[PDB]
Amino acid sequence: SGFRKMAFPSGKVEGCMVQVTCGTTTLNGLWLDDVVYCPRHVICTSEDMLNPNYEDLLIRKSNHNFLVQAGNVQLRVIGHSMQNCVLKLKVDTANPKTPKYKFVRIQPGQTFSVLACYNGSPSGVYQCAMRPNFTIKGSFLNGSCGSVGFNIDYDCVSFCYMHHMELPTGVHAGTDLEGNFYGPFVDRQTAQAAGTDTTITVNVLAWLYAAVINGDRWFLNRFTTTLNDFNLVAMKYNYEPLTQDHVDILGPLSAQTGIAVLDMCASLKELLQNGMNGRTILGSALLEDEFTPFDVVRQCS
Amino acid sequence: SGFRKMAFPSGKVEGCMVQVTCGTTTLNGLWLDDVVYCPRHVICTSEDMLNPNYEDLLIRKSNHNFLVQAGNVQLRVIGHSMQNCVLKLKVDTANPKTPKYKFVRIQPGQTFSVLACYNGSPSGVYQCAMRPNFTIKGSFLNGSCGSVGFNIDYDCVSFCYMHHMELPTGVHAGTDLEGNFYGPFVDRQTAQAAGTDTTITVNVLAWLYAAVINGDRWFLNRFTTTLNDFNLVAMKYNYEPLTQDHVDILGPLSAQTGIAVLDMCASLKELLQNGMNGRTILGSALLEDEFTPFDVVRQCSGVTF
Ligand SMILES: O=C1N[C@]2(CCOc3ccc(Cl)cc32)C(=O)N1c1cncc2ccccc12
Ligand SMILES: O=C1N[C@]2(CCOc3ccc(Cl)cc32)C(=O)N1c1cncc2ccccc12
């Protein structure tokens, strides 16, 4: 019993964190096999703030301009290439701590653990969701660029995010491990803004099923709803539309608890109308949307 | 910017998790140097757990009755002893992954990271607090016994908790690494209840400072209070008393934000008597009490391990 925001154990990722330095800029890199991955903005100077030409800056670099440090050992860069917004530094040594890994691009609503690093050294681990507006609400300070988001499946690390920047609202933007940004963001200091954020409806429903599995039922009602009626109510509270895919995904939790998805949707509609009235659900006065249907099942079973 | 419930990196602890089996019971063990630490209830049967004589059960065991597995390698148990509610299995091999470590007993209000394990394999890491009623609001299923709580100070792991059981309210109970339970609990299947919980006041204040550091100031007011007047109000809302030690500990956050501790106390006082009024603080409609003053400083300054 009990429900917590839980991150994956970070050991397999800690053994991959290195420090990458280009001139005055120092950030984090991910050392897997003989390649160190890091945000390409490590090659930018003060003059390259608004409109950097990364191809032009990278062509002016030599291998010895990249100072890579793994612990107290300096690694030797023997090659460099750019793939979208990530820089790939070929090094003369394969990381002995390289776990079984994959690079996965995630969709909004998906969750992952973030290993926050500064100077190639891990300082903390926390859980995150990719917001519907493609930003993450992380906890990052200057120097955290190159920190990665991941999930572990058995003994395999699926790397899904690399931190790149902070938007003016304090939210964060980054890329997958292939350098493709999540969202309409670019690695430039030009005017950028996160779009209006919305609540991840399928995750709120999964969290309501987690609360039922943990013995909380106060919020349940004798009602059901159509999918369309639920969505019409949901849109009014800045909730993401709930699709037939989401309904299907909630199937196992619906079967385990005996509460049909559209039945749980009617509880959610009521909660949005009434609020909580001084009550909490899993020790929370707000509807939690950073637990996926998959997270609920693995934590509760 | 940003404030998250953040645990210490768990790598140094993952390299210590092993599986301990004694008969039908399989749980987790902490392998440090040539000793595997685990709950003493691993030696228990069905009628035993109702009223167990652990000295009598342990004396009937031989070293080969304990199957210790570190990954896919079986460790050889060459000795066994009991220290309070913890079993210590001497093994023939020192853990090469043994980090710099200490065993520390923590006080209520102090926070720590939990590495939840099943069958000697880490599955999750989460941050939590030792409640004033000596329980932890953890997330544990059957098989998680022997999972450990820890902090990291510089490059030294301080082990502070070992999970033993779940109380009827879904809250959790355990011991320090010397086997002494936190709270008035016993490691026996019997009638035990968590006492009424209270809010960790110094941690709520530390979290209000974190919110100010992140640009959330709506709750701030012109008022200040005496420590006497605040503690009278606090007791009324089941909040822990705030001591002069707590005031001194909040000093650095008070200096960084320009909000005196007793000034932040008058904000907490108003928050308790009036509520949030539909507003949130750091994306929360409740006053968070699981971030200590040190946790706030560590996260809002970026200390590494
Ligand atoms: O390290 C960087 N460089 C920045 C600064 C300039 O604007 C840009 C524009 C594009 C790019 Cl890719 C990076 C950057 C950035 O946001 N971050 C930071 C990342 N995350 C959190 C931050 C918290 C405070 C301060 C800076 C943080
Ligand atoms: O594995 C055990 N055995 C228990 C069961 C009997 O009562 C006691 C009394 C003392 C001791 Cl040391 C252990 C135990 C216990 O609570 N846990 C569990 C630990 N934590 C969470 C649990 C979630 C569900 C189920 C069992 C969980």
Containing structural domain, residue A164: 1-14+100-197
- A:254-283 residues touching chain B, CB 8 A cutoff: 280, 283
Same domain, B127 and B176: yes
Rg (CA), chain B: 21
Q: Which amino acid is at B95?
A: N
Rounded Cα distance, B257 and B213, in Å: 7
CATH number of the domain enclosing B78: 2.40.10.10
* Long-range pairs of A166-170 with CB within 8 A, sequence gap ≥ 24: A166/A140, A166/B1, A167/A135, A167/A192, A167/A193, A167/A194, A168/A192, A168/A193, A169/A193, A169/A194, A170/B1, A170/B2, A170/B214, A170/B215
Same domain, A105 and A87: no
- Residue B193 at interface with chain A, using a CB cutoff of 8 Å: no
Same domain, A46 and A136: no
Cβ distance B9 to A124 less than 8 Å, yes or no, reads: yes
How close is the nearest chain B Cα to the Cα of A125, in Å? 5
Same domain, B289 and B148: no
Rounded Cα distance, A177 and A163, in Å: 10
Beta-bridged to residue A277, according to DSSP, are none
Are B202 and B293 in contact, with CB atoms under 8 Å apart? yes
- Domain count for chain B: 3
**Angle, alpha carbons B35-B39-B43 (nearest 5°):** 95
> Which of B62, B84, B99 marks a domain boundary?
B99
Active site residue B41: yes
Are B140 and B128 in contact, with CB atoms under 8 Å apart? no
CB neighbours of A132 closer than 8 A, spacing ≥ 6?
A108, A109, A197, A198, A200, A240
CATH number of the domain enclosing A243: 1.10.1840.10
B18-40 in b/e burial notation, b at 16+ Cβ within 10 A?
bbbbbeebbbbbbbbebbbbbbb
Active site residue B22: no
Rounded Cα distance, A259 and A219, in Å: 12
Rounded Cα distance, A136 and A131, in Å: 6
Rounded Cα distance, A19 and B275, in Å: 45
The Cβ of residue A252 has, within 10 Å, a number of other Cβ atoms equal to: 15
- Residue A26 at interface with chain B, using a CB cutoff of 8 Å: no
DSSP H helical ranges for chain A = 11-14, 54-59, 201-213, 227-236, 244-249, 251-257, 261-274, 293-300
Same domain, A73 and A19: yes
The Cβ of residue B62 has, within 10 Å, a number of other Cβ atoms equal to: 8
Q: Which two tokens stand for residue A48?
A: 């390259």
Resolution of the entry in angstroms: 2.1
The residue written with tokens 């968590």 in the block is B194
Residue A281 has φ and ψ, to the nearest 5°, of -125, 120
Cβ distance A9 to B10 less than 8 Å, yes or no, reads: yes
- Residue B119 at interface with chain A, using a CB cutoff of 8 Å: no
Q: DSSP code of B79?
A: E
Cβ distance B125 to A9 less than 8 Å, yes or no, reads: yes
Same domain, A165 and A203: no
Method: X-ray
Same domain, B297 and B202: yes
Determine the 3-state secondary structure of B199 from DSSP.
Answer: strand
Q: Which two tokens stand for residue A237?
A: 């509270």
Same domain, A21 and A72: yes
- Residue A15 at interface with chain B, using a CB cutoff of 8 Å: yes
Which of B113, B31, B29, B90 shows the shortest CA–CA distance to B41? Answer: B29
First-residue to last-residue Cα distance in chain B: 20
> Which of A181, A197, A213 marks a domain boundary?
A197
Same domain, A265 and A288: yes
Same domain, B68 and B104: no
Q: DSSP code of B169?
A: T
Same domain, B70 and B213: no
Beta-bridged to residue B158, according to DSSP, are B102, B151
Residues of B in contact with A118 (CB under 8 A): 302, 304
> Which of A197, A232, A254 marks a domain boundary?
A197
Same domain, B165 and B47: no
Burial of A192 (0-12, 13-18, 19+ CB in 10 A): middle
